[PDB]
């Protein structure tokens, strides 16, 4: 039953493989990182405080899943060691997924990181409430899921990250809303980043160790791009696998059911781009947010451009200049005739300044290579008969046998 997920698998040592799956065994993949109900109940009974509860649960989980044995060479056995999901541009989005990368200059403890995450959780919800105005989002009960990487490139286990920190954050789209498109997701991510940056506690708590304040990367939403999934290791140049994404529990302040929150971390429907929504009975009406605008172009760019235009004067575009010569960049052949006409001066200059390579360019043809708003690039094809099929390099004198093929282009610009 379609639609289906499509995954990209990275092979060892080199190559790639593709999978298209209709169903899979998800109990085996997440089997080694689950906590028994009795343990959670007893631990919750012992500790009333939420922060200590989360820290203790994370400590207990950390030392449970020892390793994953390496898979076989065949792609059917390595799909359980590496896997990445591919964005599809013809389906709707029902999950907000953020990939945080932090570059730090001084090592940081674990409690500082936990406090920073607790503070980060608060501003994102305010931004989300602002963005979706027809839905009720309670900042003290909405769930947000945090996954953190491994270590190797009452006190909780030591954290000894060398130089970078990687995290994943997942949260659902409040009902009854849905999203559509690739620019809308970038707008949402940028708004969320701006909202989080303006917070005061977060910057104070984490601002010391961090180098720069660029956290979120907005280039992961495009047709065909892939993103890695939790519980899977990342292949390394040396060959050994490392860096499994495993959960980190940050309990909401007013959570009423700790066991449900703890158990929901292993649901494959919570970290997929286009997974079906989780409603209760049925949707009476749904609102689709199908656009947020064009590009950003900050204020500091528009104002500067206007000032420069008013001060230095105007500058025309390539189209007007080409039209002045009675040639248009459309239809292809209109500019091709201009290039053919101009070929004479180019050939004369080549003859005058590069005497040895003169008989090669006796007869040639022009074919379009690249076009843009203010730059055109045409290719010089050696028709069909030139004796020396492949043109030679005009700068150096490569080996006698190594008659390296060089391609020749003509570039037009306003200048």
Partner 1 sequence: TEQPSPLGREAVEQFFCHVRAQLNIGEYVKHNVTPRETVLDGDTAKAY
Partner 2 sequence: RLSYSWAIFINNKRCVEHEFGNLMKVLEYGLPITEEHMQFVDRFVVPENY
Partner 3 sequence: TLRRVLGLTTACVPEEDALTARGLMEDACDRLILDAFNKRLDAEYWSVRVSPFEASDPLPPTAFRGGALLDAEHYWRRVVRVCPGGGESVGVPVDLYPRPLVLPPVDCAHHLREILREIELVFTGVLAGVWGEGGKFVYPFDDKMSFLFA
Closer of 16 and 282 to partner 1 (Cβ): 282
361 φ, ψ (degrees, to nearest 5) = -95, 30
The answer to whether residues 339 and 410 touch, using CB atoms and an 8 Å cutoff, is yes
Query: With binding defined as CB under 6 A, does residue 307 bind ligand A1BXB?
Result: yes
Site residues for partner 3, 79-98, by CB under 8 A, read: 90
Contacts of 65 (CB under 8 A, 6+ apart): 32, 33, 244, 246
Q: Which two tokens stand for residue 169?
A: 């954050």
Contacts of 198 (CB under 8 A, 6+ apart): 123
Residues in the chain: 415
What is the edge-to-edge ordering of all strands in the sheet holding 95-103? 95-103, 164-172, 145-148, 246-248
Query: With binding defined as CB under 8 A, does residue 164 bind partner 1?
Result: no
Binding partner of residue 195 among Zn ion, ligand A1BXB, partner 1, none, CB under 5 to 8 Å per kind? Answer: partner 1
Site residues for partner 1, 226-285, by CB under 8 A, read: 282-285
CB of 415 to partner 2, least distance (A): 6
The Cα 91–Cα 178 span in angstroms is 11
Q: What angle do CA 279, 254, 263 make, to 5 degrees?
A: 55
Query: With binding defined as CB under 8 A, does residue 290 bind partner 3?
Result: yes
Closer of 188 and 233 to partner 3 (Cβ): 188
Tell how strand 177-179 and strand 409-412 pair up.
unpaired
| Strand, helix or coil for residue 196 | helix
Q: Which two tokens stand for residue 132?
A: 């979706």
53 membership: H or E segment, kind and range: helix 50-62
DSSP at 342: H
Binding mask 347-386 for partner 2 (x = CB under 8 A): ------xx-------------------xx-----------
Instruction: List the one residue from 141, 308, 342, 358 that touches partner 2 (CB under 8 A).
Output: 308
Closer of 180 and 303 to ligand A1BXB (Cβ): 303
Binding partner of residue 411 among partner 1, Zn ion, partner 2, none, CB under 5 to 8 Å per kind? Answer: partner 2
The Cα 406–Cα 393 span in angstroms is 6
Instruction: List the one residue from 39, 52, 103, 130 that touches partner 1 (CB under 8 A).
Output: 130
Binding partner of residue 130 among ligand A1BXB, partner 2, partner 1, none, CB under 5 to 8 Å per kind? Answer: partner 1
- Kindly determine how many residues on this chain lie close enough to bind partner 3 according to the rule CB under 8 A: 5
The answer to whether residues 221 and 186 touch, using CB atoms and an 8 Å cutoff, is yes
CA 150 to chain centre: 21
CB of 291 to partner 3, least distance (A): 8
Closer of 200 and 395 to partner 1 (Cβ): 200
Q: Which two tokens stand for residue 137?
A: 């989002």
The Cα 363–Cα 344 span in angstroms is 11
Binding partner of residue 74 among partner 2, Zn ion, partner 3, none, CB under 5 to 8 Å per kind? Answer: none
Query: With binding defined as CB under 8 A, does residue 280 bind partner 3?
Result: no
Binding mask 255-294 for ligand A1BXB (x = CB under 6 A): ----------------------------------------
CB of 290 to partner 3, least distance (A): 5
Instruction: List the one residue from 12, 75, 79, 126 that touches partner 1 (CB under 8 A).
Output: 126
Query: With binding defined as CB under 8 A, does residue 276 bind partner 2?
Result: no
Residue carrying the six token digits 């970038």: 186
Nearest residue to 229 (alpha-carbon basis) of 271, 189, 193, 187? 271
CB of 73 to partner 3, least distance (A): 34
Binding partner of residue 15 among partner 2, Zn ion, partner 3, none, CB under 5 to 8 Å per kind? Answer: none
- Kindly determine how many residues on this chain lie close enough to bind partner 1 according to the rule CB under 8 A: 25
Alpha-carbon torsion 351, 356, 360, 366, what sign?
A: negative
**Interface with partner 3 (CB under 8 A):** 90, 180-181, 288, 290
**Interface with ligand A1BXB (CB under 6 A):** 304, 307-308, 311
**Interface with partner 2 (CB under 8 A):** 308, 312, 353-354, 374-375, 411, 413, 415
């Amino acid at each position: 039953q379609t639609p289906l997920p499509v995954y990209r698998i990275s092979m060892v040592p080199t190559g790639q493989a593709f999978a298209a799956l209709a169903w899979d065994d998800w109990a085996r993949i997440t089997r080694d990182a689950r906590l028994a109900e009795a343990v959670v109940s007893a631990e919750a009974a012992a500790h009333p405080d939420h922060g200590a509860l989360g820290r203790r649960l994370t400590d207990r989980i950390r030392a449970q899943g020892p390793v994953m044995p390496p898979g076989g060479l065949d792609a059917g056995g390595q799909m359980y060691v590496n896997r990445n999901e591919i964005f599809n541009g013809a389906l709707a989005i029902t999950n907000i997924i953020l990939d945080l990368d932090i570059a730090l200059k001084e090592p940081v403890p674990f409690r500082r990181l936990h406090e920073a995450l607790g503070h980060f959780r608060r501003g994102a919800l305010a931004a989300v409430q602002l963005l979706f105005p027809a839905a009720r989002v309670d900042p003290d009960a909405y769930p947000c899921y945090f996954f953190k990487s491994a270590c190797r490139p009452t006190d909780s286990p030591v954290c000894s990250c060398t130089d970078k920190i990687g995290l994943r954050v997942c949260m659902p789209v409040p009902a009854p809303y849905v999203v559509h498109g690739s620019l809308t997701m970038r707008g949402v991510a940028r708004v969320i980043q701006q909202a989080v940056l303006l917070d005061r506690d977060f910057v104070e708590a984490i601002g010391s160790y961090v180098k720069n304040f660029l956290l979120i990367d907005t280039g992961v939403y495009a047709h065909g791009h892939s993103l890695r999934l939790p519980y899977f290791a990342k292949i390394a140049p040396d060959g050994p696998a490392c860096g499994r994404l495993l959960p980190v529990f940050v309990i909401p302040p007013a959570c009423k059911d700790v066991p449900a929150f703890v158990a929901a971390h292993a649901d494959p429907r919570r970290f997929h781009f286009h997974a079906p929504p989780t409603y209760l009975a049925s949707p009476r009406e749904i609102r689709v947010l199908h656009s947020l605008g064009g590009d950003y172009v900050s204020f500091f760019e528009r104002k500067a451009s206007r000032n420069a235009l008013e001060h230095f004067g105007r500058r025309e575009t390539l189209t007007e200049v080409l039209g002045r010569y009675n040639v248009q960049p459309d239809a292809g052949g209109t500019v091709e005739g201009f290039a053919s006409e101009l070929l004479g001066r180019i050939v004369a200059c080549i003859e005058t300044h590069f005497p040895e390579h003169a008989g090669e360019y006796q007869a040639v043809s022009v074919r379009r290579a690249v076009s843009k708003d203010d730059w055109v690039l045409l290719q010089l094809v050696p028709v069909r008969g030139t004796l020396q099929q492949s043109l030679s390099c005009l700068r150096f004198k490569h080996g006698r046998a190594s008659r390296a093929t060089a391609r020749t282009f003509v570039a037009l610009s306003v200048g």
